[PDB]
Amino acid sequence: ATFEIVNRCSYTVWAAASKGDAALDAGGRQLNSGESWTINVEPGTNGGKIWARTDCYFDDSGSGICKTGDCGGLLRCKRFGRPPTTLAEFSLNQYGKDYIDISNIKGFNVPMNFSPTTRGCRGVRCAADIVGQCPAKLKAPGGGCNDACTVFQTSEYCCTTGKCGPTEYSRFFKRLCPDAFSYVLDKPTTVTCPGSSNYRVTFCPTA
C-alpha cells in the first residue's frame, strides 16, 4: 500500500512511520511546508502508525531530538513516538479489510487528515485547535496536548483493568475531535476500507 504523507503545515515536521518494533519504509523524514513523502507499507501490516514530530534537531547520522513524537532520538523511527502525538493508525489486509483511525489516546501535537486515495470508504480528521484549547494540566511544555494517561498514570486514564469510563480529559479531546479515539474504550471511530486501499495523511489539512 502507498501512503502519501503531506505537510500542509506552515512549519517543518519530521514524519514518522512505525509498527512499534520496526520502521515502515524509511521510518522518518523531514517535511518542509508543502512537501510530500510517499512511502510503501507492506500488505498485512498490523498496528501501523504515522505521526508528525515538531522542533527536531538531527546530526549527520540521523540522531537527535524532537519536542513531540521523539522515537528514541532517531530520524528513522523503529519505535513509537513520545506522545503528545496525533496518531494515524492502520491495520491492512485484515481478513480482506483495511482498518484506519485517528487517535488522541497518546494526546495531540499536529492536526491531521487520514483519507484513502482509492474508493470505498471515507477519511477521518482531527483538525480542531486542541493545543490552543488544551486544559492547563495536559499542556506539554515542548508543544502539544498530552492525554491524561501520559500525565497522571492512573488505571482510570490508562484503562489498565480494561474497565474504565470517559473522563473530563477524554471528553475535551472527544468534543474537539469526535472522529478520533479519546480514550482506550472510546466507542470506535475505526473506518473500514477495502483491503489494499491507498492513503493520504495530511498534516494541517485546513491551516
mmCIF file with all atom_site columns, C-alpha atoms in Angstrom:
data_model
loop_
_atom_site.group_PDB
_atom_site.id
_atom_site.type_symbol
_atom_site.label_atom_id
_atom_site.label_alt_id
_atom_site.label_comp_id
_atom_site.label_asym_id
_atom_site.label_entity_id
_atom_site.label_seq_id
_atom_site.pdbx_PDB_ins_code
_atom_site.Cartn_x
_atom_site.Cartn_y
_atom_site.Cartn_z
_atom_site.occupancy
_atom_site.B_iso_or_equiv
_atom_site.pdbx_formal_charge
_atom_site.auth_seq_id
_atom_site.auth_comp_id
_atom_site.auth_asym_id
_atom_site.auth_atom_id
_atom_site.pdbx_PDB_model_num
ATOM 1   C CA . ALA A 1 1   ? 0.000   0.000   0.000  1.00 0.00 ? 1   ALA A CA 1
ATOM 2   C CA . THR A 1 2   ? 1.119   3.611   -0.694 1.00 0.00 ? 2   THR A CA 1
ATOM 3   C CA . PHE A 1 3   ? 0.779   6.353   1.921  1.00 0.00 ? 3   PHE A CA 1
ATOM 4   C CA . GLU A 1 4   ? 1.300   9.892   0.656  1.00 0.00 ? 4   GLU A CA 1
ATOM 5   C CA . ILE A 1 5   ? 2.363   11.943  3.698  1.00 0.00 ? 5   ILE A CA 1
ATOM 6   C CA . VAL A 1 6   ? 1.789   15.688  3.019  1.00 0.00 ? 6   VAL A CA 1
ATOM 7   C CA . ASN A 1 7   ? 2.858   18.544  5.310  1.00 0.00 ? 7   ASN A CA 1
ATOM 8   C CA . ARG A 1 8   ? 0.341   21.373  4.729  1.00 0.00 ? 8   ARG A CA 1
ATOM 9   C CA . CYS A 1 9   ? 1.614   22.992  7.996  1.00 0.00 ? 9   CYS A CA 1
ATOM 10  C CA . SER A 1 10  ? 3.331   26.427  7.781  1.00 0.00 ? 10  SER A CA 1
ATOM 11  C CA . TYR A 1 11  ? 6.134   24.737  9.818  1.00 0.00 ? 11  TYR A CA 1
ATOM 12  C CA . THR A 1 12  ? 8.525   21.842  9.204  1.00 0.00 ? 12  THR A CA 1
ATOM 13  C CA . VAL A 1 13  ? 7.558   18.446  10.648 1.00 0.00 ? 13  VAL A CA 1
ATOM 14  C CA . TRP A 1 14  ? 9.501   15.211  10.781 1.00 0.00 ? 14  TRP A CA 1
ATOM 15  C CA . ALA A 1 15  ? 7.074   12.489  9.647  1.00 0.00 ? 15  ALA A CA 1
ATOM 16  C CA . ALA A 1 16  ? 7.457   9.046   11.234 1.00 0.00 ? 16  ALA A CA 1
ATOM 17  C CA . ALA A 1 17  ? 6.009   5.656   10.326 1.00 0.00 ? 17  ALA A CA 1
ATOM 18  C CA . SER A 1 18  ? 6.365   2.603   12.562 1.00 0.00 ? 18  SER A CA 1
ATOM 19  C CA . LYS A 1 19  ? 4.564   -0.637  13.544 1.00 0.00 ? 19  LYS A CA 1
ATOM 20  C CA . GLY A 1 20  ? 6.186   -0.443  17.019 1.00 0.00 ? 20  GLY A CA 1
ATOM 21  C CA . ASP A 1 21  ? 9.051   -2.998  16.594 1.00 0.00 ? 21  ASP A CA 1
ATOM 22  C CA . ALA A 1 22  ? 10.063  -1.738  13.076 1.00 0.00 ? 22  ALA A CA 1
ATOM 23  C CA . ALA A 1 23  ? 10.228  1.271   10.804 1.00 0.00 ? 23  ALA A CA 1
ATOM 24  C CA . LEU A 1 24  ? 7.668   1.496   7.987  1.00 0.00 ? 24  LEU A CA 1
ATOM 25  C CA . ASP A 1 25  ? 9.595   2.247   4.730  1.00 0.00 ? 25  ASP A CA 1
ATOM 26  C CA . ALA A 1 26  ? 12.401  4.685   5.767  1.00 0.00 ? 26  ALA A CA 1
ATOM 27  C CA . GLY A 1 27  ? 10.520  5.250   9.121  1.00 0.00 ? 27  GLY A CA 1
ATOM 28  C CA . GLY A 1 28  ? 11.024  9.024   9.108  1.00 0.00 ? 28  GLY A CA 1
ATOM 29  C CA . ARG A 1 29  ? 11.746  12.184  7.103  1.00 0.00 ? 29  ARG A CA 1
ATOM 30  C CA . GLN A 1 30  ? 11.870  15.975  7.290  1.00 0.00 ? 30  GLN A CA 1
ATOM 31  C CA . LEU A 1 31  ? 8.820   17.505  5.584  1.00 0.00 ? 31  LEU A CA 1
ATOM 32  C CA . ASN A 1 32  ? 9.118   21.245  4.913  1.00 0.00 ? 32  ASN A CA 1
ATOM 33  C CA . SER A 1 33  ? 5.824   23.147  4.394  1.00 0.00 ? 33  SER A CA 1
ATOM 34  C CA . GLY A 1 34  ? 4.072   21.653  1.339  1.00 0.00 ? 34  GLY A CA 1
ATOM 35  C CA . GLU A 1 35  ? 6.450   18.671  0.890  1.00 0.00 ? 35  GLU A CA 1
ATOM 36  C CA . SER A 1 36  ? 5.041   15.202  0.094  1.00 0.00 ? 36  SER A CA 1
ATOM 37  C CA . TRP A 1 37  ? 6.654   11.890  1.112  1.00 0.00 ? 37  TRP A CA 1
ATOM 38  C CA . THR A 1 38  ? 5.321   8.700   -0.493 1.00 0.00 ? 38  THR A CA 1
ATOM 39  C CA . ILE A 1 39  ? 6.035   5.501   1.493  1.00 0.00 ? 39  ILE A CA 1
ATOM 40  C CA . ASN A 1 40  ? 5.263   1.853   0.724  1.00 0.00 ? 40  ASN A CA 1
ATOM 41  C CA . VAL A 1 41  ? 3.734   -0.155  3.649  1.00 0.00 ? 41  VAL A CA 1
ATOM 42  C CA . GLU A 1 42  ? 3.776   -3.982  3.324  1.00 0.00 ? 42  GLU A CA 1
ATOM 43  C CA . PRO A 1 43  ? 0.336   -5.564  2.936  1.00 0.00 ? 43  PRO A CA 1
ATOM 44  C CA . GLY A 1 44  ? -0.883  -7.283  6.149  1.00 0.00 ? 44  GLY A CA 1
ATOM 45  C CA . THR A 1 45  ? 0.848   -4.554  8.239  1.00 0.00 ? 45  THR A CA 1
ATOM 46  C CA . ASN A 1 46  ? -0.857  -4.730  11.665 1.00 0.00 ? 46  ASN A CA 1
ATOM 47  C CA . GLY A 1 47  ? -0.755  -1.791  14.137 1.00 0.00 ? 47  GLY A CA 1
ATOM 48  C CA . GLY A 1 48  ? 0.900   0.648   11.688 1.00 0.00 ? 48  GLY A CA 1
ATOM 49  C CA . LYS A 1 49  ? 1.189   4.243   12.941 1.00 0.00 ? 49  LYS A CA 1
ATOM 50  C CA . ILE A 1 50  ? 2.077   7.544   11.282 1.00 0.00 ? 50  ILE A CA 1
ATOM 51  C CA . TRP A 1 51  ? 2.637   10.769  13.156 1.00 0.00 ? 51  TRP A CA 1
ATOM 52  C CA . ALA A 1 52  ? 4.373   14.096  12.972 1.00 0.00 ? 52  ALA A CA 1
ATOM 53  C CA . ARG A 1 53  ? 7.269   15.297  15.148 1.00 0.00 ? 53  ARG A CA 1
ATOM 54  C CA . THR A 1 54  ? 7.897   19.007  15.854 1.00 0.00 ? 54  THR A CA 1
ATOM 55  C CA . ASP A 1 55  ? 11.076  21.037  16.627 1.00 0.00 ? 55  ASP A CA 1
ATOM 56  C CA . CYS A 1 56  ? 13.625  18.350  15.710 1.00 0.00 ? 56  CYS A CA 1
ATOM 57  C CA . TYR A 1 57  ? 17.411  18.583  15.609 1.00 0.00 ? 57  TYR A CA 1
ATOM 58  C CA . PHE A 1 58  ? 19.240  15.697  13.791 1.00 0.00 ? 58  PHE A CA 1
ATOM 59  C CA . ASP A 1 59  ? 23.024  15.482  13.222 1.00 0.00 ? 59  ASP A CA 1
ATOM 60  C CA . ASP A 1 60  ? 24.668  13.901  10.115 1.00 0.00 ? 60  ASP A CA 1
ATOM 61  C CA . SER A 1 61  ? 23.982  10.312  11.468 1.00 0.00 ? 61  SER A CA 1
ATOM 62  C CA . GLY A 1 62  ? 20.123  10.707  11.925 1.00 0.00 ? 62  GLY A CA 1
ATOM 63  C CA . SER A 1 63  ? 20.410  11.041  15.757 1.00 0.00 ? 63  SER A CA 1
ATOM 64  C CA . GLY A 1 64  ? 18.911  13.915  17.749 1.00 0.00 ? 64  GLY A CA 1
ATOM 65  C CA . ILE A 1 65  ? 15.695  15.040  19.430 1.00 0.00 ? 65  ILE A CA 1
ATOM 66  C CA . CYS A 1 66  ? 12.081  16.218  18.829 1.00 0.00 ? 66  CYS A CA 1
ATOM 67  C CA . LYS A 1 67  ? 9.891   18.122  21.293 1.00 0.00 ? 67  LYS A CA 1
ATOM 68  C CA . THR A 1 68  ? 6.916   15.916  20.198 1.00 0.00 ? 68  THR A CA 1
ATOM 69  C CA . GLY A 1 69  ? 6.806   12.322  18.910 1.00 0.00 ? 69  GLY A CA 1
ATOM 70  C CA . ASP A 1 70  ? 10.537  11.622  19.508 1.00 0.00 ? 70  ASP A CA 1
ATOM 71  C CA . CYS A 1 71  ? 11.202  7.906   18.792 1.00 0.00 ? 71  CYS A CA 1
ATOM 72  C CA . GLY A 1 72  ? 14.422  7.281   20.833 1.00 0.00 ? 72  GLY A CA 1
ATOM 73  C CA . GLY A 1 73  ? 16.298  10.244  19.217 1.00 0.00 ? 73  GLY A CA 1
ATOM 74  C CA . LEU A 1 74  ? 16.094  8.783   15.652 1.00 0.00 ? 74  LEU A CA 1
ATOM 75  C CA . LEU A 1 75  ? 15.183  10.480  12.326 1.00 0.00 ? 75  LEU A CA 1
ATOM 76  C CA . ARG A 1 76  ? 14.183  6.959   11.030 1.00 0.00 ? 76  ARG A CA 1
ATOM 77  C CA . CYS A 1 77  ? 11.693  5.701   13.710 1.00 0.00 ? 77  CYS A CA 1
ATOM 78  C CA . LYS A 1 78  ? 11.811  1.939   14.541 1.00 0.00 ? 78  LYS A CA 1
ATOM 79  C CA . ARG A 1 79  ? 9.662   2.515   17.680 1.00 0.00 ? 79  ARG A CA 1
ATOM 80  C CA . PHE A 1 80  ? 6.583   4.575   18.549 1.00 0.00 ? 80  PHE A CA 1
ATOM 81  C CA . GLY A 1 81  ? 6.999   8.228   19.343 1.00 0.00 ? 81  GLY A CA 1
ATOM 82  C CA . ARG A 1 82  ? 6.838   10.034  22.686 1.00 0.00 ? 82  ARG A CA 1
ATOM 83  C CA . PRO A 1 83  ? 3.124   11.100  22.661 1.00 0.00 ? 83  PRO A CA 1
ATOM 84  C CA . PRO A 1 84  ? 1.973   14.032  22.636 1.00 0.00 ? 84  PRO A CA 1
ATOM 85  C CA . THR A 1 85  ? 1.288   12.542  19.153 1.00 0.00 ? 85  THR A CA 1
ATOM 86  C CA . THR A 1 86  ? -1.805  12.756  16.990 1.00 0.00 ? 86  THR A CA 1
ATOM 87  C CA . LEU A 1 87  ? -1.831  9.177   15.515 1.00 0.00 ? 87  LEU A CA 1
ATOM 88  C CA . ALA A 1 88  ? -2.821  7.920   12.095 1.00 0.00 ? 88  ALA A CA 1
ATOM 89  C CA . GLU A 1 89  ? -3.426  4.204   12.899 1.00 0.00 ? 89  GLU A CA 1
ATOM 90  C CA . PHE A 1 90  ? -3.877  1.374   10.410 1.00 0.00 ? 90  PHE A CA 1
ATOM 91  C CA . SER A 1 91  ? -4.139  -2.399  10.167 1.00 0.00 ? 91  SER A CA 1
ATOM 92  C CA . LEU A 1 92  ? -4.044  -3.524  6.489  1.00 0.00 ? 92  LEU A CA 1
ATOM 93  C CA . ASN A 1 93  ? -5.373  -6.675  4.669  1.00 0.00 ? 93  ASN A CA 1
ATOM 94  C CA . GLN A 1 94  ? -7.067  -7.943  7.900  1.00 0.00 ? 94  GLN A CA 1
ATOM 95  C CA . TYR A 1 95  ? -9.447  -10.703 6.659  1.00 0.00 ? 95  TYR A CA 1
ATOM 96  C CA . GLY A 1 96  ? -9.867  -8.713  3.362  1.00 0.00 ? 96  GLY A CA 1
ATOM 97  C CA . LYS A 1 97  ? -10.316 -5.258  5.019  1.00 0.00 ? 97  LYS A CA 1
ATOM 98  C CA . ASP A 1 98  ? -8.102  -2.251  5.946  1.00 0.00 ? 98  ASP A CA 1
ATOM 99  C CA . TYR A 1 99  ? -8.854  -0.524  9.301  1.00 0.00 ? 99  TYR A CA 1
ATOM 100 C CA . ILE A 1 100 ? -7.866  3.147   9.767  1.00 0.00 ? 100 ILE A CA 1
ATOM 101 C CA . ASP A 1 101 ? -8.414  5.632   12.567 1.00 0.00 ? 101 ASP A CA 1
ATOM 102 C CA . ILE A 1 102 ? -7.097  8.765   14.149 1.00 0.00 ? 102 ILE A CA 1
ATOM 103 C CA . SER A 1 103 ? -6.305  8.533   17.879 1.00 0.00 ? 103 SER A CA 1
ATOM 104 C CA . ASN A 1 104 ? -5.816  11.181  20.597 1.00 0.00 ? 104 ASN A CA 1
ATOM 105 C CA . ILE A 1 105 ? -5.134  8.338   23.085 1.00 0.00 ? 105 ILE A CA 1
ATOM 106 C CA . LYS A 1 106 ? -1.431  9.443   23.040 1.00 0.00 ? 106 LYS A CA 1
ATOM 107 C CA . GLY A 1 107 ? -2.531  13.101  23.008 1.00 0.00 ? 107 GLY A CA 1
ATOM 108 C CA . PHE A 1 108 ? -2.311  15.670  20.188 1.00 0.00 ? 108 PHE A CA 1
ATOM 109 C CA . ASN A 1 109 ? 0.570   17.669  18.627 1.00 0.00 ? 109 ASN A CA 1
ATOM 110 C CA . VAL A 1 110 ? -0.432  18.289  14.965 1.00 0.00 ? 110 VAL A CA 1
ATOM 111 C CA . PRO A 1 111 ? -3.866  18.401  13.243 1.00 0.00 ? 111 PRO A CA 1
ATOM 112 C CA . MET A 1 112 ? -4.310  15.571  10.792 1.00 0.00 ? 112 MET A CA 1
ATOM 113 C CA . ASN A 1 113 ? -6.426  14.230  7.940  1.00 0.00 ? 113 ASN A CA 1
ATOM 114 C CA . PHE A 1 114 ? -6.199  10.470  7.265  1.00 0.00 ? 114 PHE A CA 1
ATOM 115 C CA . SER A 1 115 ? -8.020  9.671   3.953  1.00 0.00 ? 115 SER A CA 1
ATOM 116 C CA . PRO A 1 116 ? -7.972  6.870   1.385  1.00 0.00 ? 116 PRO A CA 1
ATOM 117 C CA . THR A 1 117 ? -6.866  7.854   -2.149 1.00 0.00 ? 117 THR A CA 1
ATOM 118 C CA . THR A 1 118 ? -8.790  4.813   -3.507 1.00 0.00 ? 118 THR A CA 1
ATOM 119 C CA . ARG A 1 119 ? -12.626 4.480   -3.279 1.00 0.00 ? 119 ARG A CA 1
ATOM 120 C CA . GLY A 1 120 ? -14.937 2.513   -0.889 1.00 0.00 ? 120 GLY A CA 1
ATOM 121 C CA . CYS A 1 121 ? -14.676 4.430   2.407  1.00 0.00 ? 121 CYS A CA 1
ATOM 122 C CA . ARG A 1 122 ? -14.346 7.921   3.935  1.00 0.00 ? 122 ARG A CA 1
ATOM 123 C CA . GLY A 1 123 ? -11.404 9.633   5.663  1.00 0.00 ? 123 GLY A CA 1
ATOM 124 C CA . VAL A 1 124 ? -11.140 10.897  9.237  1.00 0.00 ? 124 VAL A CA 1
ATOM 125 C CA . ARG A 1 125 ? -9.928  14.228  10.520 1.00 0.00 ? 125 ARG A CA 1
ATOM 126 C CA . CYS A 1 126 ? -8.832  15.725  13.818 1.00 0.00 ? 126 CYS A CA 1
ATOM 127 C CA . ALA A 1 127 ? -8.080  19.376  12.789 1.00 0.00 ? 127 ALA A CA 1
ATOM 128 C CA . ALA A 1 128 ? -9.502  21.371  15.764 1.00 0.00 ? 128 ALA A CA 1
ATOM 129 C CA . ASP A 1 129 ? -7.027  23.635  17.653 1.00 0.00 ? 129 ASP A CA 1
ATOM 130 C CA . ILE A 1 130 ? -6.565  21.055  20.533 1.00 0.00 ? 130 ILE A CA 1
ATOM 131 C CA . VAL A 1 131 ? -3.188  22.651  21.522 1.00 0.00 ? 131 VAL A CA 1
ATOM 132 C CA . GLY A 1 132 ? -4.745  26.140  21.749 1.00 0.00 ? 132 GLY A CA 1
ATOM 133 C CA . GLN A 1 133 ? -7.702  24.860  23.826 1.00 0.00 ? 133 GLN A CA 1
ATOM 134 C CA . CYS A 1 134 ? -5.667  22.264  25.794 1.00 0.00 ? 134 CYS A CA 1
ATOM 135 C CA . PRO A 1 135 ? -6.591  22.118  29.514 1.00 0.00 ? 135 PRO A CA 1
ATOM 136 C CA . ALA A 1 136 ? -3.720  23.596  31.579 1.00 0.00 ? 136 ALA A CA 1
ATOM 137 C CA . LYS A 1 137 ? -2.755  20.269  33.299 1.00 0.00 ? 137 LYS A CA 1
ATOM 138 C CA . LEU A 1 138 ? -2.365  18.444  29.914 1.00 0.00 ? 138 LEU A CA 1
ATOM 139 C CA . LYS A 1 139 ? -0.293  21.210  28.201 1.00 0.00 ? 139 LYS A CA 1
ATOM 140 C CA . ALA A 1 140 ? 3.085   19.743  27.120 1.00 0.00 ? 140 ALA A CA 1
ATOM 141 C CA . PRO A 1 141 ? 5.767   22.457  27.631 1.00 0.00 ? 141 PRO A CA 1
ATOM 142 C CA . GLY A 1 142 ? 7.559   21.336  24.403 1.00 0.00 ? 142 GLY A CA 1
ATOM 143 C CA . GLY A 1 143 ? 4.276   21.950  22.481 1.00 0.00 ? 143 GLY A CA 1
ATOM 144 C CA . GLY A 1 144 ? 1.116   19.860  22.145 1.00 0.00 ? 144 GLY A CA 1
ATOM 145 C CA . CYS A 1 145 ? -1.604  18.479  24.445 1.00 0.00 ? 145 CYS A CA 1
ATOM 146 C CA . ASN A 1 146 ? -0.962  15.253  26.457 1.00 0.00 ? 146 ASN A CA 1
ATOM 147 C CA . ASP A 1 147 ? -3.604  12.574  27.082 1.00 0.00 ? 147 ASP A CA 1
ATOM 148 C CA . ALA A 1 148 ? -4.470  12.219  30.830 1.00 0.00 ? 148 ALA A CA 1
ATOM 149 C CA . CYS A 1 149 ? -2.886  8.705   30.927 1.00 0.00 ? 149 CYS A CA 1
ATOM 150 C CA . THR A 1 150 ? 0.606   10.075  29.955 1.00 0.00 ? 150 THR A CA 1
ATOM 151 C CA . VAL A 1 151 ? 0.263   12.913  32.553 1.00 0.00 ? 151 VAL A CA 1
ATOM 152 C CA . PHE A 1 152 ? -1.364  11.111  35.536 1.00 0.00 ? 152 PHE A CA 1
ATOM 153 C CA . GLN A 1 153 ? -0.528  7.413   35.008 1.00 0.00 ? 153 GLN A CA 1
ATOM 154 C CA . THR A 1 154 ? -3.804  6.185   36.620 1.00 0.00 ? 154 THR A CA 1
ATOM 155 C CA . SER A 1 155 ? -5.773  2.969   35.948 1.00 0.00 ? 155 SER A CA 1
ATOM 156 C CA . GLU A 1 156 ? -8.847  5.055   35.039 1.00 0.00 ? 156 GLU A CA 1
ATOM 157 C CA . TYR A 1 157 ? -6.970  7.213   32.454 1.00 0.00 ? 157 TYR A CA 1
ATOM 158 C CA . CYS A 1 158 ? -4.786  4.366   31.037 1.00 0.00 ? 158 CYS A CA 1
ATOM 159 C CA . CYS A 1 159 ? -7.651  1.778   31.210 1.00 0.00 ? 159 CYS A CA 1
ATOM 160 C CA . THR A 1 160 ? -5.265  -0.735  32.852 1.00 0.00 ? 160 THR A CA 1
ATOM 161 C CA . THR A 1 161 ? -8.017  -3.110  34.189 1.00 0.00 ? 161 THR A CA 1
ATOM 162 C CA . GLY A 1 162 ? -9.722  -2.920  30.734 1.00 0.00 ? 162 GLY A CA 1
ATOM 163 C CA . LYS A 1 163 ? -12.628 -1.300  32.652 1.00 0.00 ? 163 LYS A CA 1
ATOM 164 C CA . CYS A 1 164 ? -12.840 2.493   32.566 1.00 0.00 ? 164 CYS A CA 1
ATOM 165 C CA . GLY A 1 165 ? -15.104 5.327   31.530 1.00 0.00 ? 165 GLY A CA 1
ATOM 166 C CA . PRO A 1 166 ? -14.784 8.615   29.732 1.00 0.00 ? 166 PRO A CA 1
ATOM 167 C CA . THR A 1 167 ? -13.202 11.432  31.789 1.00 0.00 ? 167 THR A CA 1
ATOM 168 C CA . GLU A 1 168 ? -13.206 15.238  31.826 1.00 0.00 ? 168 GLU A CA 1
ATOM 169 C CA . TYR A 1 169 ? -9.873  14.940  29.917 1.00 0.00 ? 169 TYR A CA 1
ATOM 170 C CA . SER A 1 170 ? -11.036 12.317  27.318 1.00 0.00 ? 170 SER A CA 1
ATOM 171 C CA . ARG A 1 171 ? -14.245 14.438  26.732 1.00 0.00 ? 171 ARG A CA 1
ATOM 172 C CA . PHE A 1 172 ? -12.139 17.519  25.931 1.00 0.00 ? 172 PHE A CA 1
ATOM 173 C CA . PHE A 1 173 ? -10.375 15.544  23.115 1.00 0.00 ? 173 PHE A CA 1
ATOM 174 C CA . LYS A 1 174 ? -13.750 13.967  22.053 1.00 0.00 ? 174 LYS A CA 1
ATOM 175 C CA . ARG A 1 175 ? -15.615 17.356  21.988 1.00 0.00 ? 175 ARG A CA 1
ATOM 176 C CA . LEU A 1 176 ? -12.948 18.898  19.656 1.00 0.00 ? 176 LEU A CA 1
ATOM 177 C CA . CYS A 1 177 ? -12.360 15.695  17.534 1.00 0.00 ? 177 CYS A CA 1
ATOM 178 C CA . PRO A 1 178 ? -15.409 13.434  17.713 1.00 0.00 ? 178 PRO A CA 1
ATOM 179 C CA . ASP A 1 179 ? -13.977 11.303  14.829 1.00 0.00 ? 179 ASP A CA 1
ATOM 180 C CA . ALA A 1 180 ? -10.821 10.343  16.883 1.00 0.00 ? 180 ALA A CA 1
ATOM 181 C CA . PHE A 1 181 ? -10.331 7.890   19.820 1.00 0.00 ? 181 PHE A CA 1
ATOM 182 C CA . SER A 1 182 ? -10.369 9.985   23.045 1.00 0.00 ? 182 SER A CA 1
ATOM 183 C CA . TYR A 1 183 ? -9.557  7.042   25.411 1.00 0.00 ? 183 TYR A CA 1
ATOM 184 C CA . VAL A 1 184 ? -8.893  3.294   25.160 1.00 0.00 ? 184 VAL A CA 1
ATOM 185 C CA . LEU A 1 185 ? -12.578 2.141   25.363 1.00 0.00 ? 185 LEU A CA 1
ATOM 186 C CA . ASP A 1 186 ? -13.984 5.066   23.308 1.00 0.00 ? 186 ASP A CA 1
ATOM 187 C CA . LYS A 1 187 ? -16.852 3.930   21.027 1.00 0.00 ? 187 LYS A CA 1
ATOM 188 C CA . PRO A 1 188 ? -14.719 3.017   17.946 1.00 0.00 ? 188 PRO A CA 1
ATOM 189 C CA . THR A 1 189 ? -14.233 5.633   15.178 1.00 0.00 ? 189 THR A CA 1
ATOM 190 C CA . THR A 1 190 ? -12.337 2.940   13.212 1.00 0.00 ? 190 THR A CA 1
ATOM 191 C CA . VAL A 1 191 ? -13.212 3.281   9.490  1.00 0.00 ? 191 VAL A CA 1
ATOM 192 C CA . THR A 1 192 ? -13.425 0.031   7.411  1.00 0.00 ? 192 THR A CA 1
ATOM 193 C CA . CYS A 1 193 ? -11.708 0.274   3.932  1.00 0.00 ? 193 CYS A CA 1
ATOM 194 C CA . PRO A 1 194 ? -11.304 -2.292  1.140  1.00 0.00 ? 194 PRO A CA 1
ATOM 195 C CA . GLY A 1 195 ? -8.166  -4.431  1.577  1.00 0.00 ? 195 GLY A CA 1
ATOM 196 C CA . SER A 1 196 ? -5.107  -2.848  -0.221 1.00 0.00 ? 196 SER A CA 1
ATOM 197 C CA . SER A 1 197 ? -6.564  0.689   -0.224 1.00 0.00 ? 197 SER A CA 1
ATOM 198 C CA . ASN A 1 198 ? -4.017  3.503   -0.647 1.00 0.00 ? 198 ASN A CA 1
ATOM 199 C CA . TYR A 1 199 ? -3.958  6.544   1.700  1.00 0.00 ? 199 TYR A CA 1
ATOM 200 C CA . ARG A 1 200 ? -3.009  10.156  2.210  1.00 0.00 ? 200 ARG A CA 1
ATOM 201 C CA . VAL A 1 201 ? -2.003  11.533  5.621  1.00 0.00 ? 201 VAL A CA 1
ATOM 202 C CA . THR A 1 202 ? -2.188  15.365  5.597  1.00 0.00 ? 202 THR A CA 1
ATOM 203 C CA . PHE A 1 203 ? -0.672  17.430  8.456  1.00 0.00 ? 203 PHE A CA 1
ATOM 204 C CA . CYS A 1 204 ? -2.559  20.774  8.954  1.00 0.00 ? 204 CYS A CA 1
ATOM 205 C CA . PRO A 1 205 ? -5.262  19.758  6.441  1.00 0.00 ? 205 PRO A CA 1
ATOM 206 C CA . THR A 1 206 ? -7.136  23.122  6.903  1.00 0.00 ? 206 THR A CA 1
ATOM 207 C CA . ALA A 1 207 ? -4.369  25.512  8.168  1.00 0.00 ? 207 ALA A CA 1
#
